[PDB]
Design a binder for these strands. Structure first.
Ligand code: ZN
Ligand code: ZN
Ligand code: ZN
Ligand code: ZN
Lengths: 111, 235, 124, 199, 199, 199, 159, 161
RNA sequence: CAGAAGAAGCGCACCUAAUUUCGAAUCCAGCAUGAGAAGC
């Protein structure tokens, strides 16, 4: 604790017991031209939502534009090769619906 | 709100020890080369500094921010592209009385189906635009008997009148729908007769209700209203 | 907000819509453990860091008292904890002290047990 | 009259909730699709009447205690004007001192209203004899109201909270005998000055 | 009046239990994954209808005794308003004196609801012709309800207890002839005051 | 009607028994222990389907006898509603008079369920080609189920005992061709008044 | 020809087009395929529905005692006497019809349209007071207009 | 003004001919066009394709369609649940309706079973298969026709769908 | 810095997870009070 307070870092020991951080979502799109269709005040909008540290910011194409001008193991087989191989092994009954089910189950846990 | 002045206003609330521009206490928000040491002099390095300078102070391991209803996103697979984490999403912002929801195309498709079902089921053919025969007394007799036993009720007479205002054809549609014996359940939409009976008798009173209401649609509106107003005084 | 319960150690992080639990475990009195387990309340998730009894030992006791809906951990931490909980129950029964949970609590703890790897973002 | 008691009331549903639609056009339009519509605002929010529930609660509780409370509720009964329920809720002379707002949801019908299937089952055959659909309000739905007592007496918040416990125990509205309407209340009582707005 | 009976009813589930989802949105959401969803609250607890089971129980037993009771199981059958079942659970003239709550589980759906595979076997080739998935409540899961009887009478707890025994024998919910829904009921009754909340 | 036939059936296994687990979570929890888990309750007791073997037994022998009977085993079949098996066990609108409880054991899994090594042997090398581990219920295990028949008819006990003789010679559960499932049923039937719980 | 009677003010701009979802009624004419809104159809539904629908004896000294009693136990009121006097001025027949309407006990609920007596009355005394109100006002039917006005003017001074 | 809606399904309310409708007033260069939901689905695919980029149905006549749907409704193949779910997939787009009718008609390669409801009555296996193919062809021909005429065809067999 | 108690191998696969009926009916929609006061 003494060494990390020496690194200017606040530390709360468990023999003791405060700011309110709150991540917010910013529209950043102008909600003037807005109608009511089915008793809901709605607007179809095209945008590029961004997740910034501490803030989710919905952002119009103006955003992508500015950021566009600013900016600008496992083996390998083609997509059609994968579909053709799983098609053949499905009709040769090596790959089954249960094997594909558990491969999807383990792939949903990570790679 | 404990406020202290320095050569700097050090307001110390319970929501953070704010300081607009170095005290010896813990400082949470710094509302701010010469600039870097001032932050280095503060013990318990601040959570956020509200300011080229930002690039450097980010690399000094410090958070920055550079200067209504709650907005809730309902749409979530993003991508690294152009540095910032990001996704393409087209959607709909909706402005509720206490919130702003960010919905997608499935919500609008849902409310499109929910509105289209309301739209398509409001006008039913010739609204406000081969019937059997019965004497007026026989109509009075059968509607009175089927009002005493609970087949032709006040709600049935009311809903007869509302559809018969919308034309003869809508009234025939309503009467055919009420008399319809569903082949999967063997049941008509007539309210069942009160009093001890038998299924042949009950089916014949249902048939009597069908023929007496159908023989009333051929009559004039005023004559229909003056037959039914003796039973349901509203309509 | 985060509560530091810890006998047993645990980290309840009440978000405001859930009660997420970190490392319910006991390295070493059974009654004060049970009272301290009752002090947590119904938790939505019990996240396990590692498969040591200092951070996983009380997980079957939490499914005895039905205080946890899902026990997420790493797929190797789970398999480890199979052997870990049967060994802890072997030692506890073998010592002739009254078992703190049972083998059925072990089984049912692995009935609601999900498993994810590193760098896999869950949303619950 | 210098003070005003504001009781902010926050009601969370511990059960399905139903309160029927009273508006004839809206009821008919919804009865083309669901036989028992729930009461709804034009802003798509759920509205329970709240003054009658509180008044009925206080009338049965205060009649049980043995107090001088009449029975509004009997057919065209006249409030006497001398009870405590006539003071807090009104008589033919003076109005009620407590303005009881409707219990309006903070959520919209898409989020809290579900169409549900209810049955009548024949006893001997044990099969479905009748089927109907009814709109209900989900569990955990949060509703708000603000009771505003003008000329506040000292036993006014206690009676409101007692009525809130009675509404918790009997249910707020709708099919209360079937299990619907079981709720819980949170009471943010306060005492504001009447000249709060005059700056 | 002046007292209210409170029957605190605790179900322990002995065989598995199924009561299907009634809400169209929740059912249509779950029929993607499971062909027989279970009734569930929005706070993820299991919901069993209890007033109709207690009604139906008492109608069968009192019609078998020969005491006069109406039938409210027949299609669109008007309640008589004179029988003891009409006094306890309701008629069209007077409301039900017994306000039966919903049987709500003490535990969450991810702790007592399991998804199960059911079949239809061809009687001749002894081979699965149909496979469906249904959600069931596990055995030993505990449900709670309050039967809150206003205007108490002497034979209104015993008939309820009698009806509970019938629900112990026949079952509650759905799939009652395949063995689903055999349950045990434990009863705790108290004559609470009607003015108990008045402080 | 006025009576109800309660048939208490005690079944003793005369060979190993396998009824496979239907719950998803119980199978996925046991997939690293036993490849064929036994259907057990959450009270750790073995749960066997009983309605469906009785129906299949009665349908096969009544089809063999030539008496009119439909097949509720063919895929997405609709029970005719007129045959006797539609009377006892049910149709789509009339429901089963014979409420057939599950065969819950009298003991726990630790006493009756054992984990076993089953094999597939090559016919030309006489070698273990596949080894797979499955649970089974031991011999002598006692299971109990109560069949409660409402509206009792004359040929309802006799048909059920005939069906139980069919399950005695054919088997209950899974792996029936290998020798698994051979049992002995013992029946004590009694007619109880439907108003027996009134007091 | 096409006329849009729907208000064109509120319009979002998605996909670089000014689009707005509407739910209305496309309506035919001699040459005008007009898009008319929800309100227009509420106009024509109300218009068409409204168009298709629009097309004994007792003593006077005992009578004074009865109307006093029934005005003091609140069965007879100022409003009842007012509508009784209007129906009397529209005829004898319609006033008997109004008295019948008010006294009519509905078989479904057992409720008459009088005002309930206040006071500790049981069932059949309230029923006898309703019968008393029936026979008192229906005995007042046969009397001449001046005498009915002088009888009612003691109780409702406006009429 | 340029209506992009076929002006059919027009009832006669009193002395008025009209059509219940929901669409979009897409005000453009001088058109102020009235385009339906299909245009909005195209527009949504336009946007949700363009924005990502920065990172043979048979003809069967209408009366034969009512005749076949009626025959299949009385022999318990096109039940009310099938008409309801077909309507829910039809309102979700025509491609989802092709996917649904393909899923229901797909004879599973292992079991040999289609997902229709079995015919009630005496029919041979070849006859049952021809009825299943009739169900596929009739609903696949119903996918082409517009939303209003499909609502009129399906409302005479399922009154609530 | 946390648990620990005559050989050998194996302890795995596959299918199916759909279908259908019902979604109505009924009662009620009244009553009461106040019709004045005051300035220019
Ligand atoms: Zn460790
Ligand atoms: Zn009073
Ligand atoms: Zn009754
Ligand atoms: Zn049959």
């Amino acid at each position: 604790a003494k060494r990390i307070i020496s690194k200017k870092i606040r530390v709360e020991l468990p023999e003791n017991y405060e700011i309110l951080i709150e991540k917010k979502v910013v529209l950043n799109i102008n909600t003037d031209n807005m109608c009511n269709f089915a008793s809901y005040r709605l607007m179809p909008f095209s945008g590029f939502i961004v997740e910034k540290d501490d803030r989710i910011e919905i952002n119009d194409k103006n955003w992508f534009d500015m950021i566009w001008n600013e900016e600008y193991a496992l083996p390998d087989m083609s997509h059609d090769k994968i579909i053709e191989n799983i098609e053949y092994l499905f009709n040769i009954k090596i790959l089954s619906k249960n094997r594909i089910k558990e491969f999807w189950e383990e792939f949903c846990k990570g790679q | 709100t404990k406020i202290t002045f320095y050569n700097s206003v050090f307001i110390e609330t319970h929501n953070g020890n704010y300081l607009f521009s170095m005290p010896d206490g813990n400082v949470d928000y710094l509302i701010l080369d010469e600039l870097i040491d001032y932050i280095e002099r503060l013990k318990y390095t601040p959570y956020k500094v509200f300011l080229i300078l930002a690039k450097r102070i980010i690399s000094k391991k410090i958070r920055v921010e550079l200067p209504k209803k709650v907005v809730l996103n309902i749409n979530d697979n993003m991508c690294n592209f152009a540095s910032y984490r990001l996704m393409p999403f087209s959607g709909f912002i909706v402005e509720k009385d206490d919130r702003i929801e960010i919905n997608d195309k499935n919500w609008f498709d849902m409310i499109w189906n929910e509105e289209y079902n309301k739209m398509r089921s409001q006008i039913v053919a010739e609204d406000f635009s081969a019937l059997p025969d019965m004497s007026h007394d026989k109509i009075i007799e059968n509607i009175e008997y089927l009002f005493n036993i609970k087949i032709l009720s006040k709600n049935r007479i009311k809903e007869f009148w509302e559809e018969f205002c919308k034309g003869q054809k809508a009234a025939i549609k309503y009467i055919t729908q009420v008399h319809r014996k569903n082949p999967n359940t063997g049941r008509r939409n007539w309210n069942p007769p009160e009093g001890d009976f038998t299924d042949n008798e009950i089916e014949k009173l249902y048939e009597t209700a069908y023929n007496t209401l159908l023989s009333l649609i051929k009559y004039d509106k005023n004559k229909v209203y003056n037959i039914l107003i003796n039973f349901n005084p509203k309509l | 907000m985060i509560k530091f319960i810890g006998t047993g150690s645990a980290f309840l992080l009440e978000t405001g819509n859930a009660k997420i639990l970190i490392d319910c475990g006991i390295e070493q009195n059974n009654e004060i453990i049970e009272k301290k387990i009752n002090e947590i309340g119904k938790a939505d998730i019990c996240i396990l860091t590692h498969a040591h009894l200092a951070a996983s030992g009380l997980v079957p006791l939490l499914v005895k008292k039905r205080k946890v809906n899902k026990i997420i951990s790493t797929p190797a931490t789970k398999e480890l904890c199979r052997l870990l909980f049967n060994d802890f129950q072997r030692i506890q029964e073998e010592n002739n002290d009254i078992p703190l949970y049972s083998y059925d609590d072990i089984e049912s703890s692995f009935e609601i047990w999900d498993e994810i790897d590193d760098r896999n973002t869950i949303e619950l | 009259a210098k003070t005003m008691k504001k009781i902010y009331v926050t009601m969370k549903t511990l059960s399905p909730l139903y309160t029927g639609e009273v508006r004839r056009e809206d009821k008919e339009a919804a009865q083309k699709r669901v036989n028992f519509p729930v009461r709804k605002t034009a802003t798509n929010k759920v509205l329970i009447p709240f003054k009658g529930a509180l008044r009925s609660a206080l009338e049965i509780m205060l009649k049980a205690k043995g107090e001088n409370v009449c029975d509004t509720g009997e057919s065209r009964a006249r409030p006497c004007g001398r009870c405590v329920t006539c003071s807090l809720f009104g008589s033919m002379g003076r109005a009620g001192r407590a303005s009881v707002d409707f219990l309006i949801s903070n959520d919209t019908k898409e989020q809290i209203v579900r169409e549900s299937t209810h049955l009548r089952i024949e006893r001997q055959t044990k099969s479905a004899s009748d089927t109907f659909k009814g709109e209900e309000v989900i569990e955990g739905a949060t509703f708000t109201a603000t009771i505003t007592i003008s000329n506040p007496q000292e036993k006014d918040l206690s009676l409101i909270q007692s009525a809130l416990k009675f509404i918790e125990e009997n249910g707020i509205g709708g099919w209360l005998n079937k299990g619907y309407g079981r709720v819980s209340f949170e009471v943010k009582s306060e005492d504001v000055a009447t000249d709060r707005f005059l700056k």
